[PDB]
Write a protein that binds this ligand. Structure first.
Ligand SMILES: CNc1nc2cc3c(=O)[nH]c(N)nc3cc2[nH]1
Ligand SMILES: CNc1nc2cc3c(=O)[nH]c(N)nc3cc2[nH]1
Ligand SMILES: [Zn+2]
Ligand SMILES: [Zn+2]
Lengths: 371, 371
């Protein structure tokens, strides 16, 4: 039987790595992309379809689920996996980002955050870890504070310091719950905004506590790719090399490629799902907007090489019609293709690292995607 | 290879019949229920899922498709079957009902109908048959006038007489188009409102022209079940016994059972799809509204006996959550279950007629469904 958690690196190229995380509910191939399933569903897909595209793990959210249908309710119904019909690993964010993003009123303190639902609710490190336990998450995220961008050095520091205190509280809450400690994994989240010294302090604090994996927090919050990449350049090497590195909320295909070049192993974002429903399809020649009139009579599949079931069977012209009509099948087909594209991107990344030709792959990918 | 059209009756019980229609694109088991696919999609289902529920044939609409994406456009793209990915028979309504139902302004004449889209457009018997040819419909409906309910005898008569003139025009248009005449079938539509003498005149006119099948038009337009059944009692026996009888727009499960008792072989309605998206699930114990709070923690499947993939895998509690959240997967799961339920109803009807126990089935079905 598989262990609670084991990360193994099979191949490297520069700072890039490829390997596997073994957990009780399954193996995760890295670098990994996690489709987002915020309301206990990956929007417009059955879990079997999510799996058929190649996903090994999906992301859920402490924030949305604690509000609807409720964490205790999900536990009473047998946990998130049983509830939504996904039997493989699930990573859950801790709520700290979403509360500050989506809540109408918030009160922040050293204890945690109180907020008004988009009734009043509270989140603290202890309550966050508890909710993630009630959901039955396999990868639990520490409860942190995502520092807004831009931040002054003093505010970035104060924020990061609070997040490190909360990281220790998260660790202790997780370890106190024997069933959770034995069956799930806990990741810490590095903060520090764009400042190298604060990123270093945060990495040191997280490593002293000790986690199963380390996320780079506080990015993909408006800073732009050049700045994100600059911060990754110095931040990722600060993290323990032998554990996974997770870049929260990233991202566009080129962001993923560059982040892997910088040592990131795990990704999530709503882009393929959300923009799929809005008419944007990913292709190896760059994104297209299927709503455009130029596709009304185009018999080609969304992408000429894609192996997904959508590209096997339906034309751009048909999907154009569905999305213009507001048909649910349009959302379904666009989302399945985009998630499949993301998984094919991760497979090409993994295979190119394993073969020592990832640098070449990145160059070829960009030349074509941005032609 | 299969013929253009052959209807064979395998078993009878009273006025009820069970059998098959063989067409080039497939066999249709009767009595048959046709899921409705008005915008070139059965809402929220891939065609493989429509087939997996047991459907042999689906319904499309001259009216919606001629407006979006356009009949000529669909023909240029290879026809409706290729466009939407359904390779089995498709029946198309002729537009005469939908124009009067959905258009904002209409001008009616002996030539046809001109209307404003929900730009100006025209429909006539000739143009309707042509559009159904461009779509590549397998069962083409004559272009008729659906008499509003209630109608006075004089207006019902005038309307029915016009429909019979249009039925002959429909026949001639269809026969003039060699490819259509050789590969598709043409059904006539009986009119006459609730009046026995007008129903008889219309049946006689349609039989004199000669059609592959006969629809009972002008019902399911507000008259209620008692009156519908009373009109079917005398109207269906007027139609040729050796051809299929199609009751347009029916209906609720009990309406289907009673209509089969009265000699109907074919059905369509938006109820399972549309009401599925709205939260109504069909069960052998009657419909339920999955939005109701009583289902928030109910671990049972939608229906306790249903063999569909939704009932194999997900709880009422989960689907309740999805529909309350407005999630697309909720529409998907509710629609698949309801279409599957309708197909299971038709299978039970067919098997009970084949075994000479349809009367008993109808009685048992009602006792439980209305308990
Ligand atoms: C879409 N962009 C994005 N940046 C993020 C940062 C964090 C972060 O710093 N902390 C936690 N807990 N979640 C996050 C989620 C993010 N999502
Ligand atoms: C939902 N109820 C319903 N009654 C109908 C009658 C006709 C009818 O008399 N003619 C044609 N062409 N379509 C029809 C579609 C119907 N749909
Ligand atoms: Zn594809
Ligand atoms: Zn079912």
């Amino acid at each position: 039987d598989r262990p609670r958690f084991s990360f193994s690196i099979a191949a490297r190229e520069g700072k890039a790595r490829t390997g596997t995380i073994e957990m009780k509910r399954g193996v995760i191939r890295t670098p990994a992309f996690m489709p987002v399933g915020t309301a206990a569903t990956v929007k417009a897909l059955k879990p079997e379809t999510v799996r058929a595209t190649g996903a090994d793990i999906i992301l859920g959210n402490t924030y949305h689920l604690m509000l609807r249908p409720g964490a205790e309710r999900i536990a009473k119904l047998g946990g998130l996996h049983s509830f939504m019909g996904w039997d493989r690993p699930i990573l859950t964010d801790s709520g700290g980002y979403q509360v500050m993003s989506l809540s109408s009123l918030t009160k922040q303190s050293e204890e945690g955050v109180t907020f008004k639902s988009h009734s009043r609710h509270m989140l603290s490190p202890e309550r966050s870890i508890e909710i993630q336990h009630l959901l039955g998450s396999d990868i639990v995220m520490a409860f942190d504070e995502c520092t807004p961008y831009p931040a002054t050095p003093s505010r970035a520091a104060s924020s990061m310091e609070r997040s490190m205190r909360w990281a220790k509280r998260s660790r202790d809450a997780f370890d106190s719950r024997k069933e959770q400690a034995e069956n799930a994994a806990l990741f810490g989240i590095q903060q520090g905004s764009v400042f190298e010294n604060l990123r270093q302090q945060s990495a040191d604090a997280l490593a002293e506590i000790g986690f199963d994996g380390y996320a780079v927090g506080g990015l993909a919050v408006g800073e732009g790719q050049d700045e994100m990449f600059r911060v990754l350049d110095f931040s990722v090497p600060m993290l323990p090399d032998d554990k996974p590195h997770y870049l929260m909320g990233v991202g566009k295909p080129d962001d993923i490629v560059g982040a892997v070049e910088r040592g990131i192993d795990m990704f999530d974002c709503v882009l393929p799902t959300r923009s799929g429903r809005n008419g944007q399809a990913f292709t190896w020649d760059g994104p297209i907007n299927i709503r455009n009139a130029r596709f009304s009579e185009d018999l080609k599949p969304l992408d000429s090489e894609c192996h997904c079931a959508v590209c096997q069977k339906w034309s751009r012209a048909y999907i154009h019609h569905l999305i213009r009509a507001g048909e649910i099948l349009g959302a379904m087909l666009m989302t399945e293709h985009n998630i499949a594209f993301y998984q094919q991107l991760m497979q090409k990344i993994r295979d190119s690292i394993s073969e020592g030709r990832f640098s070449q792959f990145a160059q070829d990918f960009r030349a074509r995607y941005f032609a």
